[PDB]
Design a binder for this molecule. Structure first.
Ligand SMILES: CCCCCCCCCCCCCCCCCC(=O)OC[C@H](CO[C@@H]1O[C@H](CO[C@H]2O[C@H](CO)[C@H](O)[C@H](O)[C@H]2O)[C@H](O)[C@H](O)[C@H]1O)OC(=O)CCCCCCCCCCCCCCCCC
Ligand code: CLA
Ligand code: CLA
Ligand code: CLA
Ligand SMILES: CC(C)=CCC/C(C)=C\CC/C(C)=C\CC/C(C)=C\CC/C(C)=C\CC/C(C)=C\CC/C(C)=C\CC/C(C)=C\CC/C(C)=C\CC1=CC(=O)C(C)=C(C)C1=O
Ligand SMILES: CCCCCCCCCCCCCCCCCC(=O)OC[C@H](CO[C@@H]1O[C@H](CO)[C@H](O)[C@H](O)[C@H]1O)OC(=O)CCCCCCCCCCCCCCCCC
Ligand SMILES: CCCCCCCCCCCCCCCCCC(=O)OC[C@H](CO[C@@H]1O[C@H](CO)[C@H](O)[C@H](O)[C@H]1O)OC(=O)CCCCCCCCCCCCCCCCC
Ligand SMILES: CCCCCCCCCCCCCCCCCC(=O)OC[C@H](CO[C@@H]1O[C@H](CO)[C@H](O)[C@H](O)[C@H]1O)OC(=O)CCCCCCCCCCCCCCCCC
Ligand SMILES: CC1=C(/C=C/C(C)=C/C=C/C(C)=C/C=C/C=C(C)/C=C/C=C(C)/C=C/C2=C(C)CCCC2(C)C)C(C)(C)CCC1
Ligand SMILES: CC1=C(/C=C/C(C)=C/C=C/C(C)=C/C=C/C=C(C)/C=C/C=C(C)/C=C/C2=C(C)CCCC2(C)C)C(C)(C)CCC1
Ligand SMILES: CC1=C(/C=C/C(C)=C/C=C/C(C)=C/C=C/C=C(C)/C=C/C=C(C)/C=C/C2=C(C)CCCC2(C)C)C(C)(C)CCC1
Ligand SMILES: CCCCCCCCCCCCO[C@@H]1O[C@H](CO)[C@@H](O[C@H]2O[C@H](CO)[C@@H](O)[C@H](O)[C@H]2O)[C@H](O)[C@H]1O
Ligand SMILES: [Cl-]
Ligand SMILES: [Fe+2]
Lengths: 37, 34, 65, 82, 51, 37, 28, 35, 335, 51, 50, 32, 35, 32, 340, 34, 51, 37, 34
């Protein structure tokens, strides 16, 4: 159970979510700062 | 078996070519307005 | 039109044409199964590619009999 | 035919730009220079130095022969003073 | 012999192009249509259809 | 050129197609054996 | 050893003989 | 074989003469406008 | 008769002919007819040719065991070299066909006619009052035929080394060329594929952009092509909507808005690129070959550290070492 | 997958597609079922070719 | 009228004839399978599975 | 047999060329 | 007009410009390495 | 690999059914 | 809703349009180009191919490359955090991890880019025939850089990202696959070469059939950016080619679609051929030819000649081109002609 | 305000210099043959 | 099975204008794709399970 | 039966025939060699 | 020579069938009134 390669998978699955997070985090923030019509 | 090599294409062309002729005519007839 | 025995029985199943749910309906819930599916595929892929090793699973012609 | 961004022509012409970039542009250059000249680049990418392709006598190539124990096999190649 | 031959062929060739180019313009310049077909009097439109 | 006034349209009804195809096929079914010999 | 000193001068000479003309403003 | 050479030479001369005497016959004139 | 010759000149120059037989046409049409007829007959029924002059006949005709892909018209013998070899230079046709006689008759007639074909592309443009330079675009594919059929043989000293007239024969010309000249590592060739790739690229670019920005005049179940009539006044596509899209794909100033600046680029790029690739074959016809980076990067001791350029050299050696088996008697291939 | 397919099936029989989606994926237009089906079809194809 | 590559657009909104079409296709694919098998059975040699 | 097939197709293309050039649809202007 | 400074264009430009010169400086130094 | 194109094609023809057969006037582009 | 506000921002008309697609495009596209430019100057191919492949080692713009991973790796994705590299970056570089990096990333970058085409077209309200066209370059990259090595033993036999490293990929396919003799490939060049012709011939045709809309010689200024009349005489162009070539266009809408069809169709055919080369299902030989060539020692075609060239290519290249095989070919076994 | 034509001609030569340095390195660095 | 599907294809061709394909509201031909997918998907998973 | 109102006529112009035939023939000229192999 | 037996009919059917298809359409198009 929980092999080294499996541990690495989580590391890549977690570090990926982070990138998706921070990206959309910044985006949603800056988007709601200017868009007047 | 030990048949003729040209037998196949001879039969094939004997069917298609004249049948093709007919179909060309029928369809061009069918598509005439009124 | 032309009604039929079979046709009438199947009428209800085909009638709710343009019927849609309001707003973003079930979309957010769907986006979760979608994210789960993506990870699911990624797992069985990396398992097949031997990028994700698991003692117990031997991705070879072995482990068979 | 226009958008919010400040027209490049103006910026590349503005004295302020050069006052900034006469510092910034050469800085990066000298930085990249040092990255190589200090031999740091060699270690960051495991690139062999001119005297680190073979061993003194050896004339064989350090070819990686198996995926899983590759990293270990690679380290073993550096061992023989390669 | 290699340098000279290759160099002078490239020049010779491009000059044959230079020729065609400037000779083609001169013929059009003289007769006077080196700047486009006359919208009004379009020559082709005055010739019978070959179809 | 002047549109040649000697031309007429050509016609082949659906039955004639059927009667035709029937003739061609059965002829082929008759002579194929001798074609392969 | 380093005749790059030459090129430099003869290289900036070109734009100079027209830069001075951008100063004295005329005949460009 | 010596004949063929003559024949060809004559033939080639024909077209070549047609070519030279062709552009010579006031070719710039032949055009839509200015001539 | 206003004057026979005057009428003759008027018929030739006439713009009312279905096919404009021009003054260049007077030379073109006969030469092209001789070339094609000889070719067709050769490609089908010609006997094997001793191309390398080593008494080793190579059959390239259909009737002699070839198909479309393998079949070819074999270049004149290497024993002839650059000598002029017309039919009236042979004791018989049998000898003429053996020494690759037809090849010269074809390439000479073709290159001549194909040159006149360019000349005619000017003439008709002149007679029609349109701008020239169309022939200038055709000068690029022509200069390639010239380079491949005439310039390279002149340089190498024999017509036997000119590109054969066939599919597989053309492949042979390339593979051998690469071995002896390393053409892939030559700038002019690289510029060639740049024009050719770019050409196909831009051809698809323009093609797509225009056809995608067509003004609607057709039904939902009707060919979008019918929305155009031959001889229109106004344009059939929104070039301003086209530029709007492509301008946003990359960025505005990297997009064309001038149709004339567009089509010039559309024409300039491939023609110029092919011009260089034509000059490449013509330059390497005098053995000014591509870059030679063999055994360049070496280590601190002196050992040779291989690159991809070296891997290319090995492939090149194989071609060199194996091409024209029995043709060589001496170490260096200098001919 | 069969059971999940049975469950998923019942769902799509009951719950209706969100307005946002119905508009986005141009539902009620059979030529969008094709686009998605084909997408799944060649996906499956690439897999069986690999296995 | 319709281009050759558009002849089947005659079904885009005709559920009846669209089912009839898909029915014919399915028939051909099922037709092939059965008859392709017969071809193999007429040529396959079971004399040696080794 | 093979030679025949190759020449035949070739002859057919040349035949097509003829009809394509001299028996095309006359390109009519404006009123099309 | 009152143009801004830091923009999305500015970001993009720098993602390419900044590494480039850093590389151009690195490569320039390589021209002196030997053996 | 061939069916990929079919996907891209039909996908496009679905989301672009309106602009199919062509487009129509206006002159907006470079201004939000 | 935040979504429509997120949308609003993305789809804003800037200098460099972002859009939803941009969230996928720009990250990958940048890393792909970046990864190449990185390896091109720094990372070596010594431990993977026994090759120098960077400026740092002395390679030039032509000889530089990001070489494929070792044959040992197999079809491994070679993740930085994978069983091979094990989180290590330096090791990752030395195992040719940057190749799968560039490949996979660039692959998604090509997906995003076409999506951009689709997205931008929709907004501007133009037909997506620019996206349909871009499918041909996709198929090629997919077939050559992914499908092909997926059929072989490993990523090692995929084309390495580099100028020279691509030239050997050409010569390899000649020597081993006889790629030039493949009908799908022939259609390929026919499309590209024919497409590069249409590009040339159409541009030149237009520039030289233009109307006069100005009094200057440089007719470039004399163009109306706001549609109106045709800038060039389509009618004159027709009669021209109809008399010099015998055939000529007469429908701009078809002419331009044709310019789309030819090069896109060609690249697609060349893709299929490569897909067949993955399983090594090549068009190497003609059985009728070989059989006669065996019985008859005097039968020689340009086809037989080429195969001999292939044997030479395979024999002399394989040793240093396939290190993992530990090839040893004695001088006496090397196929050679006379003298050379 | 710095005149555009000066900006280009200076950045122009600056490119010729660094690129020319590269061409020199082809006869001296590791990319040599000596 | 092919022969039966053939005959069925013929019937469905001649009797194309079944009411089942007509929407009660608009009185024009229409197919409720979302619900259909659910039905089919249910049958698929049901058959998948059994297999 | 009621005349199905979903049908349209089919069209193929002379050029399309020529363009078609040209495609078929040259493809045959290309693949025939490999068919005979 | 030693070619494929089916090569002939494969080439024959590859030409006729699709060419036949076209001709059928063209002629039926051509024969449409007005
Ligand atoms: C289009 C639009 C663009 C889309 C872009 C999407 C980009 C995403 C690409 C991701 C693809 C990763 C595929 C990895 C792969 O394949 O990974 C390869 C693995 C198989 O791995 C290989 O498998 C081989 C087979 O070995 C077998 O045989 C051996 C005996 O010697 C051993 O027994 C071994 O255990 C056993 O598996 C060898 O082991 C190789 O070393 C090993 O690399 O397959 C797999 O994951 C399973 C295969 C998945 C199917 C998808 C492949 C695509 C079809 C390719 C068909 C080729 C034709
Ligand atoms: C999943 C299956 C599927 C289905 C149901 C459709 C359905 C449709 N497609 Mg289509 N298509 C598909 C897959 C499919 N496509 C794929 C995979 C591709 C990529 C190659 C395309 C590319 C495509 C284009 C480019 C076009 C269509 C069009 C159309 C529409 C009109 C069809 C027509 O009249 O053509 C009739 C076609 C013919 C009469 C000629 C066919 C001759 C073929 C090429 C020769 C081979 C026949 C052979 C038996 C096929 C074997 C099948 C094989 C899979 C085993 C129709 C809605 C057209 C459209 O939208 O109209 C506006 C259109 O322009 N399709
Ligand atoms: C009564 C129905 C029936 C039965 C029992 C069979 C039985 C058989 N058929 Mg068959 N067939 C049928 C109807 C049937 N056929 C029909 C109607 C057709 C015409 C379309 C065919 C056409 C056909 C062909 C062309 C072939 C067979 C073959 C076979 C044999 C092997 C089957 C196999 O390997 O599966 C193959 C399994 C699959 C293809 C799996 C499909 C699953 C897909 C990918 C999933 C679809 C997506 C799904 C909706 C996603 C949601 C699911 C959810 C659970 C998540 C087997 C004897 C083969 C044979 O040996 O010939 C005799 C063969 O080559 N069949
Ligand atoms: C959106 C842009 C984008 C995309 C699509 C990718 C895509 C990829 N990158 Mg990548 N990357 C990006 C931006 C992106 N990158 C950026 C901006 C950087 C700079 C920091 C990098 C730096 C980078 C490196 C250094 C590497 C990659 C690699 C990869 C590849 C493998 C990564 C992987 O396993 O995915 C994993 C996928 C995910 C994590 C997605 C998960 C999303 C779900 C919904 C979140 C769920 C999380 C939750 C906890 C799960 C709970 C389940 C429970 C059972 C635990 C893949 C092609 C690798 C590569 O190329 O190998 C050769 C590699 O080594 N990337
Ligand atoms: C956003 C954000 C988060 C910031 C990050 C930005 C970031 C890091 C991005 C990195 C992106 C990346 C690494 C690079 C992307 C690659 C890129 C630059 C693409 C190459 C583009 C390029 C320079 C090529 C342009 C080619 C060119 C000259 C155009 C050809 C034009 C052509 C002939 C088309 C014909 C044509 C043109 C028309 O114009 C019209 C009108 C019509 C009719 C027509 O036929
Ligand atoms: C994805 C796209 C990523 C884009 C990243 C930003 C790129 C920055 C480029 C800025 C160039 C610029 O704006 O144009 C610089 C100038 C445009 O000049 C513009 O003028 C405007 C006037 O209001 C404003 O002043 C703009 O700021 C100014 O840029 O160039 C043009 O005229 C056209 C340039 C087209 C370049 C295409 C690439 C070809 C490069 C040639 C290299 C071959 C050698
Ligand atoms: C000197 C004489 C030169 C003889 C040249 C012969 C030209 C060949 C004519 C090809 C037929 C043209 C045709 O069908 O399209 C004739 C059509 C002309 O008709 C077009 O019809 C279209 C549909 O309506 C549009 O309306 C166009 O505007 C209209 O012009 O031309 C094209 O549109 C296609 C252009 C590309 C032509 C094909 C290139 C020919 C290459 C031949 C290579 C084969 C070699 C085989 C060797 C063995
Ligand atoms: C902001 C915009 C920047 C955008 C970056 C986009 C990337 C552009 C391509 C990068 C080219 C890198 C070339 C390079 O670094 O060469 C740098 C190399 C380095 O030079 C090598 O240095 C080594 C160091 O030991 C050795 O000395 C070698 O002998 C020496 O050759 O220079 C060359 O010799 C090549 C000259 C440059 C030729 C490049 C032509 C590119 C044309 C293709 C254009 C793409 C299409
Ligand atoms: C010294 C001397 C001499 C000589 C003299 C002379 C003769 C000089 C000349 C000089 C010159 C004559 C120089 C020139 C220079 C030039 C240059 C240096 C240029 C540059 C350029 C550039 C850089 C450009 C730029 C650009 C670009 C890139 C893009 C677009 C725009 C522009 C154009 C701006 C003698 C003999 C007496 C001897 C003694 C001493
Ligand atoms: C009616 C009926 C019947 C009968 C039935 C039958 C008899 C059927 C048959 C059927 C069949 C018998 C079918 C078949 C089919 C087939 C097919 C459908 C095929 C197809 C094929 C294809 C399509 C191919 C193609 C190709 C080629 C040609 C080459 C290249 C590749 C490919 C593969 C693409 C019975 C009595 C029972 C009963 C009831 C009624
Ligand atoms: C891999 C990796 C990554 C990435 C990175 C990056 C993104 C980088 C970038 C980089 C870059 C982005 C770089 C750049 C470079 C550039 C260069 C180096 C350029 C050069 C240039 C030149 C040299 C030029 C030349 C020329 C031309 C081309 C044209 C004509 C003229 C002249 C001469 C000027 C990360 C960390 C994420 C993760 C891990 C891994
Ligand atoms: C979209 C998806 C994008 C994902 C991008 C992930 C990029 C970061 O990738 C991450 O790199 C770090 C180092 O930086 C690796 O980290 C690795 O090296 C570090 C030290 O350097 C070790 O302490 C660690 O145990 C090891 O995992 C991670 O294993 C990998 O997950
Ligand atoms: Cl040879
Ligand atoms: Fe155009």
């Amino acid at each position: 159970t929980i092999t080294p390669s499996l541990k690495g998978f989580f590391i890549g699955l977690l570090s990926g979510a982070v990138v998706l997070g921070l990206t959309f985090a910044v985006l949603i923030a800056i988007s709601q700062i200017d868009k007047v019509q | 078996m030990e048949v003729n090599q040209l037998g196949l294409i001879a039969t094939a062309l004997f069917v298609l070519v004249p049948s093709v002729f007919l179909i060309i005519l029928y369809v061009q007839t069918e598509s005439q307005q009124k | 039109a032309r009604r039929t025995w079979l046709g009438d029985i199947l009428r209800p199943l085909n009638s709710e044409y343009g019927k849609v749910a309001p707003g973003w309906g079930t979309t957010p819930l769907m986006a979760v199964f979608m994210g789960l599916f993506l990870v699911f595929l990624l797992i069985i892929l990396e398992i097949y590619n031997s990028t994700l090793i698991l003692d117990g699973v031997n991705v070879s012609w072995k482990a068979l009999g | 035919g226009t958008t919010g961004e400040r027209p490049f022509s103006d910026i590349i012409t503005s004295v302020r730009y050069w006052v900034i970039h006469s510092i910034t542009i050469p800085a990066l250059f000298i930085a990249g220079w040092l990255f190589v000249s200090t031999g740091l680049a060699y270690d960051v990418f495991g690139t062999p130095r001119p005297d680190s392709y073979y061993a003194q006598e050896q004339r064989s190539i350090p070819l990686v022969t198996d995926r899983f124990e590759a990293k270990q096999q690679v380290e073993t190649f550096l061992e023989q003073l390669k | 012999r290699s340098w000279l031959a290759t160099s002078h062929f490239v020049l010779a060739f491009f000059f044959l192009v230079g020729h065609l180019w400037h000779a083609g313009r001169a013929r059009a310049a003289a007769a006077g249509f080196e700047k486009g077909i006359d919208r009004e009097s379009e020559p082709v439109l005055s010739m019978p259809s070959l179809d | 050129m002047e549109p040649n006034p000697n031309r007429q349209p050509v016609e082949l009804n659906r039955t004639s197609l059927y009667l035709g195809l029937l003739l061609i096929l059965v002829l082929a079914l008759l002579f194929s054996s001798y074609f392969f010999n | 050893i380093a005749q790059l000193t030459m090129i430099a001068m003869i290289g900036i000479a070109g734009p100079m003989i027209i830069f001075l003309l951008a100063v004295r403003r005329g005949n460009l | 074989m010596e004949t063929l050479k003559i024949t060809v030479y004559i033939v080639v001369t024909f077209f070549v003469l047609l070519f030279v005497f062709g552009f010579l016959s006031g070719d710039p004139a032949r055009n839509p406008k200015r001539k | 008769s206003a004057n026979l010759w005057e009428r003759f000149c008027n018929w030739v120059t006439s713009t009312d002919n279905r096919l404009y037989v021009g003054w260049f046409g007077v030379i073109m049409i006969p030469t092209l007819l001789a070339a094609t007829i000889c070719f067709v007959i050769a490609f089908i029924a010609a006997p094997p040719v001793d191309i390398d002059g080593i008494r080793e006949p190579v059959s390239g005709s259909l009737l002699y065991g070839n198909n479309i892909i393998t079949g070819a018209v074999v270049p004149s013998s290497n024993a002839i070299g650059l000598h002029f070899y017309p039919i009236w230079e042979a004791a018989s046709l049998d000898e003429w066909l053996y020494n690759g006689g037809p090849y010269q008759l074809i390439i000479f007639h073709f290159l001549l006619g194909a040159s006149c074909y360019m000349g005619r592309q000017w003439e008709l443009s002149y007679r029609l009052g349109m701008r020239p330079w169309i022939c200038v675009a055709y000068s690029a594919p022509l200069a390639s035929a010239f380079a491949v059929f005439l310039i390279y043989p002149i340089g190498q000293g024999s017509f036997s080394d000119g590109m054969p007239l066939g599919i597989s024969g053309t492949f042979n010309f390339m593979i051998v060329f690469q071995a002896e000249h390393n053409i892939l590592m030559h700038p002019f060739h690289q510029l060639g594929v740049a024009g050719v790739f770019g050409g196909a690229l831009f051809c698809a670019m323009h093609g797509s952009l225009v056809t995608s920005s067509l003004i609607r005049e057709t039904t939902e179940t009707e060919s979008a092509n019918y929305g155009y009539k031959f001889g229109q006044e106004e344009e059939t596509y929104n070039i301003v909507a086209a530029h709007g899209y492509f301008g946003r794909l990359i960025f505005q100033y990297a997009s064309f808005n001038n149709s004339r600046s567009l089509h010039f680029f559309l024409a300039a790029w491939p023609v110029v690129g092919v011009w260089f690739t034509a000059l490449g074959i013509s330059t390497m016809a005098f053995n000014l070959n591509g870059f030679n980076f063999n055994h360049s990067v070496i280590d601190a001791k002196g050992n040779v550290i291989n690159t991809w350029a070296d891997i290319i050299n090995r492939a090149n050696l194989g071609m060199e070492v194996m091409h024209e088996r029995n043709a060589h008697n001496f170490p260096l291939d200098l001919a | 997958a069969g059971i999940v397919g049975i469950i998923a099936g019942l769902f799509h029989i009951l719950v209706r597609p969100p307005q946002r989606l119905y508009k986005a994926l141009r539902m009620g237009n059979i030529e969008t079922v094709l686009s998605s089906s084909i997408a799944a079809v060649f996906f499956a194809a690439f897999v069986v070719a690999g296995t | 009228g319709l281009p050759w590559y558009r002849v089947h657009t005659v079904l885009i909104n005709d559920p009846g004839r669209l089912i009839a079409a898909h029915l014919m296709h399915t028939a051909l694919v099922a037709g092939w399978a059965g008859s392709m098998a017969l071809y193999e059975l007429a040529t396959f040699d079971p004399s040696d599975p080794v | 047999m093979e030679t025949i097939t190759y020449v035949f197709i070739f002859a057919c293309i040349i035949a097509l060329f003829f009809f394509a050039i001299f028996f095309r649809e006359p390109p009519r202007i404006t009123k099309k | 007009v009152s143009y801004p400074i830091f923009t999305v264009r500015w970001v993009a430009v720098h993602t390419l410009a900044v590494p480039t010169i850093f590389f151009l400086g690195a490569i320039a130094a390589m021209q002196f390495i030997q053996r | 690999l061939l069916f990929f194109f079919g996907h891209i094609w039909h996908g496009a023809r679905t989301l672009f059914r309106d602009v199919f057969s062509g487009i129509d006037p206006e002159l907006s582009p470079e201004q939000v | 809703g935040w979504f429509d506000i997120l949308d609003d921002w993305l789809k804003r008309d800037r200098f460099v349009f972002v859009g939803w697609s941009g969230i996928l495009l720009f990250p990958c596209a940048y890393l792909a180009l970046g990864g190449w430019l990185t390896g091109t100057t720094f990372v070596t191919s010594w431990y993977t191919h026994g090759l120098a492949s960077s400026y740092l080692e002395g390679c030039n713009f032509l000889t530089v490359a990001v070489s494929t991973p070792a044959n040992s790796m197999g079809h491994s994705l070679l993740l930085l955090w994978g069983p091979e590299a094990q989180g290590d970056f330096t090791r990752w570089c030395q195992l040719g991890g940057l190749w799968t990096f560039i490949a996979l990333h660039g692959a998604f970058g090509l997906i995003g880019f076409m999506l951009r085409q689709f997205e931008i077209a929709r907004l501007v309200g133009v037909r997506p025939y620019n996206a349909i066209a871009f499918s041909a370059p996709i198929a090629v990259f997919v077939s050559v850089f992914l499908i092909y090595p997926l059929g072989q033993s490993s990523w090692f036999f995929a084309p390495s990202f580099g100028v020279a490293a691509i030239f050997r990929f050409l010569l390899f396919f000649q020597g081993f696959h006889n790629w030039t003799l493949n009908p799908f490939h022939m259609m390929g060049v026919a499309g590209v070469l024919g497409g590069a012709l249409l590009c040339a011939i159409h541009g030149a045709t237009v520039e030289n059939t233009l109307f006069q809309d100005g009094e200057g010689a440089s007719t470039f200024r004399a163009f109306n950016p706001t549609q109106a009349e045709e800038t060039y005489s389509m009618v004159t162009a027709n009669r021209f080619w109809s008399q010099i070539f015998g055939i000529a266009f007469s429908n701009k809408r078809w002419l331009h679609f044709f310019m789309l069809f030819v090069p896109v169709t060609g690249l697609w055919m060349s893709a299929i051929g490569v897909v067949g080369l993955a399983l090594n299902l090549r068009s190497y030989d003609f059985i009728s030819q070989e059989i006669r060539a065996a019985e008859d020692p005097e039968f020689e075609t340009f086809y037989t000649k080429n195969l001999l060239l292939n044997e030479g290519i395979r024999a002399w290249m394989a040793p240093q081109d396939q290190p993992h095989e530990n090839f040893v070919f004695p001088e006496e076994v090397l196929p050679r002609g006379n003298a050379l | 305000r710095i005149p555009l034509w000066i900006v280009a001609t200076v950045a122009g030569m600056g490119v010729i210099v660094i690129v020319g340095l590269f061409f020199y390195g082809a006869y001296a660095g590791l990319g040599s043959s000596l | 099975l092919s022969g039966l599907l053939f005959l069925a294809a013929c019937w469905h061709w001649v009797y194309w204008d079944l009411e089942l394909f007509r929407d009660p509201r608009t009185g024009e031909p229409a197919l409720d794709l979302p619900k259909m997918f659910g039905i089919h998907l249910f049958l698929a998973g049901l058959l998948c399970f059994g297999f």
